[model samples]
Target: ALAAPPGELTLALTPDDKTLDPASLDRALAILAEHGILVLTGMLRTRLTDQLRTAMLDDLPEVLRQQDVPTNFVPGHVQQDPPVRESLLFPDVLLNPVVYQITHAVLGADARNAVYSGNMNLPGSHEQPVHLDEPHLWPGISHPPYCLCVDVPLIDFTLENGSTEYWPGSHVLNPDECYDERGCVLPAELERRRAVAPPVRFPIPVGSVVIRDGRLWHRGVPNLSAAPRPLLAMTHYTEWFDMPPIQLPDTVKSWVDGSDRHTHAHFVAGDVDHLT
Candidate 1:
C-alpha cells in the first residue's frame, strides 16, 4: 500500500488538524483531547482564491437532499446520476506524490484504497452528524481490510459554512469509535475518545488540511450563514477494499474502476512536515 513509515508522514501526527503556531497547535491539540477534534490552518493556501471558491459555489449541490447537500453522500441520498460525476482533474500541485506517501504511512505499505476520490462541494441547509469513516469503510453494509478516512479542506472551513468537526486524537477509540448517525452504539468506554460536539464555530482557512481517525466521531455542521461554505473531502486508505460487505453497484463500480493505489494512500517520505 505504501513505502514510507507511519511516523514519518508529516501530517500523520495530524498537523493539518492543529493551529500553525506550536503553542497554538499544543492548545488546539489539548482542546481536541477535551472535545475530540483539532483544527489546522493553512495547508493549501494558494487554492483558496476567490475564483476557485466562486467556481465551487457556482454549481450548487441542491439536488442532493437538503441534508445530504453539504455532507458525504451515503448512496441513495444522492441521485446517483451523471454530470454529478463531473469533478475536474486534480491540479499538478495537489497531485503531489507526497499525498499518497503519507496515506501509506498511516495505514502501512499494504494499505488498500478505500474511497477513490472525494468531492469539493458546499454544505448548506443539510447537516451531518459526528461519525468515523474507518469503521464504515464500506457504506450501506460492508467492511474491508484495514481502513482509514482522510479529509482535506479547500478553503476556510467554519461552523457557519459547515466545516468538519472532529475530536483530537480520537483515532485511539479504535473498533467501536467509528460511528455515524449517532446513538447507534452502546457506551463502551475507550481510550482517548474523540467526538465532534454538535458542530463548532472554529474556522479553517483555504490550503489547510485536516486528518481524523476514521473511528472517532465527527460530522459537518450545516452552514448557518446565507453565504456558501464549500469543503473538499477525500478519504484515503489501503487498496482493493470493500465498504459494506455488499457488492458495489455498477454506478459505484465506475468510481472503483477509475482509482489507482496512490489516490488511496497518504504517504510519508515526501510531505514537508516529515523533514522536521
Candidate 2:
C-alpha cells in the first residue's frame, strides 16, 4: 500500500527512538519486500561508527599484506575481518532491535546470525561480475527470502569509493537461468535486467545499516579513492538454513546469550583467529 518511489528506500530514526516506530517498521518491511533493500539511518551512534572506522583503517595494511595476492571475488577486493575484540562488540551493531524486528518479520522469529566477515574495496578495485551472495533456495520456483545480508559501512559509501551496485527487485527471479556453474550472473541475464531495470549504487552514510536479500544481484564497483572502503558484513538465515556457527570469544558471549534470535556463535576461551 506504500506509494514511495523505487530507488534507495530509507528510514531515519527519531531522537527518542529505542526501536523503530511501528509505522516505520512496517514501511521498512514493505520496501525490502518490493525493492529487496532498505537503509536504516541513525541506528548507530557516531562515536561507535568513528571508532570502527579507525580500527578498520589501522588493520587495513596488515590485512592486505596477509593476502599477498588478491583472493577475493575480484581484483583489489579483499575479504577482511573486523577486529573481534570485546570492546568493539556493541549490542547496537550486533543486536539492534530495529534490525531484529524487520529481519524476524521477513525471515522468521528463529532467524539467526550465520556469518560475521567483511569486504574491503581497495583503491583501484575492479568491478566484480554480477553475482549473488547466495542463490535461490530451490531450482525452479522462487520462494520467500531465507537469508539477508546486513552491512555496516565503516565510512560513508559513495560511487568513488565503491558503493555496491544493486539490481533492485531481482531477488524474485528464478536462479536456474541467471547464474552459471560458478554462481556468477550470466551476461545475457545481466543485460536483460539492465535494459529493464538498471543497477543502482546507493550513497549510504556512515552509521547506517543496509539490509538486503541474499539473492539480489549485486557487485562491487571500482574504488577510485586513495583509501580502502571497508564494510562490516553479517548474514542472518532462517533457522532451517544450514550454516556453520561463527567463532566468538567468551568475553562477548553475553551479547547474544539470551536474545530471542540466535547468533550461532561458538564461544572460545582465547582469542579467535578471525583473520585467517
Candidate 3:
C-alpha cells in the first residue's frame, strides 16, 4: 500500500496537457461545457505555491476580524481576500497558458480578470451553504458562460480536509426565472438536483486548478483536519462587460507585461499594501 505522505492528496486529476496547442484548447472548451468544471493538475511549481500560501494566509484570520467590512467568516470557514502584490503572485500558475486559451475560447481574447482573492478554511470550520458565486446573468434564458472562476489550491485537497463539492452540469440547470441575488439554492431546488446529480466531492491535488463555470453549484465542506486549507480565486470576465482591473505595484506590472497570459487581464497601478 502507498503510505500517505505529508499533505499528500488522497484523490486528484492527473496532468494531461502534453501539448498546449490549439487542439488542447478546443478540448478544454468542450470539457468545460460538458463538466462545468475542469481540473488541471501539476500546473504550478511546488516551492512557488508554498511561498504563495505563506504570504496569502499569514495573519489572514486576524486581518479579516479587524476589517470594517462585514463578514460571516470565522469560527471555521474564514474567508478573506487581502490585497496581494503582483510580485508575490506567480504568473505561470495564476495565468496558465491553457487557462488563457480555454477562457478566451469561451469569453474571447479580450476577456479581463477583475477579481483576485483567496480564502482559508481553518480547522473546525463548518460546511458552507451551497451557493453560486454569480447567478445566471439573465433570467429564464440559457447561454454560454460569460464569466468563470479559476480556483488554485495552495495545498493538497482531500475530502478529509474539506475539498470543494460540485454538482456537475448544474451551471446549465438554472432556476425557472432569473434572480440577481447571491444564488443560494432553495431546499426544493437542492432536493431536485440531489435526486438527479448529487454534489461530487473533489479531492484534487495542489497545483491543480478547478476552472469552473461561475454559475456552477458548489460549496466548501468543513475542515475536519488540523491544518487550514487555503485556495486562491480569480474571476475572469468576457470582453462584453467592463470591471475595474486590479492594481499592482509598478515592478509587478513590468513583470506581467512580459507574460503571454497576462495580456488577457487588465492590471492597473497602485499600492498592494493598502489592500491588506
Candidate 4:
C-alpha cells in the first residue's frame, strides 16, 4: 500500500471489527519499536476526512490569529484552537478501532485521552526547529513509550503541503544527548541523527492515522501550496503518565460515555493539561 521500504512498515487495519490479530499487533509494535512510528493507511473514511478539513479551516483560523492562542513553533503552523469537545468530537476519529487497539495495546485499554487537539500548516509557513513532542522521561533506561500521538490528517498531506518530516529511530536516543527543552532538539544531535536515520516525509492520503512515539524527532516543513493542511491530533496516555486530563463538555461527556464507542476512549469532565 506504500513505498516505505522494509525499514518502515505501513500496515492495513482490520476491517469492520478494528481489532488486529496478535500477529499484526506484534508487527506494528515491532516496527514502532525499531522505527518509532507506524503509518496506518485507510483507517478512516474519505467523507469524514473532508468534513474534518472543512470544520478545522472554519473554526481555527481566527483562534490561531489571536496572540493568546498557542501556535506552532512558527507562523502558518497554527496550534490547537477551539476545544477538544468541538475539535475531537467526530465519530469517525473517536471510534476508530485500530487507533484504540494500538493505544490499548501499549498504554492499556483504560488509558486516558490526555489531549485532543490539532494544527493547520498554512501556506508560506517556514520550517520549524527540529523537535520532539515530549523528551525522554527516563534518563538512561529505554522502555515502552509512555504516550502516543495519533495524527489524523483531514486532507491529503504531501511534501508540497508540508507533511511532517520525521527522523526515524531517533526515539531511542537519551534525553541528555540533545538540548531537551521538553521539545526542541539540539542542532548537533539533530545533525547526527539526520546523518544516520535521516528524515522522511510521506505523501499521506486522507483517512490515515500516523501513530508516532512522542520522543521521535520531527518538524513541520514549509507549505508551499496555496491551501492549508489540517491535522486532528490526539494523545493517548497510560494513567501513570504525567499528562493532565482534558475535561469534556457536559453534553459531549454524556454522549461519549453513553455511546458504544466509549469503550477504548473516555471523555469525561475537567480541565487537564493544555495541548501545545
Highest-TM-score candidate: 2
TM-score, cand. 4 vs. native? 0.86
| Model 2 per-residue lDDT tens digits across residues 1-276 | 122223447887742466677787888888999889888777788888888788888877777677364446778888877888888778887787788888888888999988888888889998899988888867789699999999998898886788888889888888457687656889999988899888877577788888999988889889999988989999989999889888888998776777886798888899887776
- Show how many residue pairs clash in every candidate, following the order shown: 47, 0, 2, 2
What TM-score would each prediction reach against the true structure? 0.53, 0.93, 0.84, 0.86
Once fitted onto the true fold, the runs of candidate 3 whose alpha carbons sit more than 4 angstroms away are 1-19, 64-75, 177-180, 257-270
* Candidate 4 lDDT: 0.73
What is the descending lDDT order?
Answer: 2, 4, 3, 1
Residue 30 alpha-carbon offset, candidate 2, angstroms? 1.1
In the range 1-276, model 3's lDDT, one tens digit per residue, is: 112211211113234443366655666677678778877767777877788788766757566566564333235665556445655766665566667777777887777677777777878877767788877767777788988898988888888887887877788877673333657767678888898877777566787777889888888778898888888888778766666666556666666666545434445565555334
lDDT of 3: 0.69
Candidate 1 residue 71 Cα shift, in angstroms, is 6.7
Residue 138, model 2: Cα distance from true site in angstroms: 1.5
Q: In model 2, where do residues sit more than 4 Å from their true spots?
A: 1-8, 14-16, 67-70
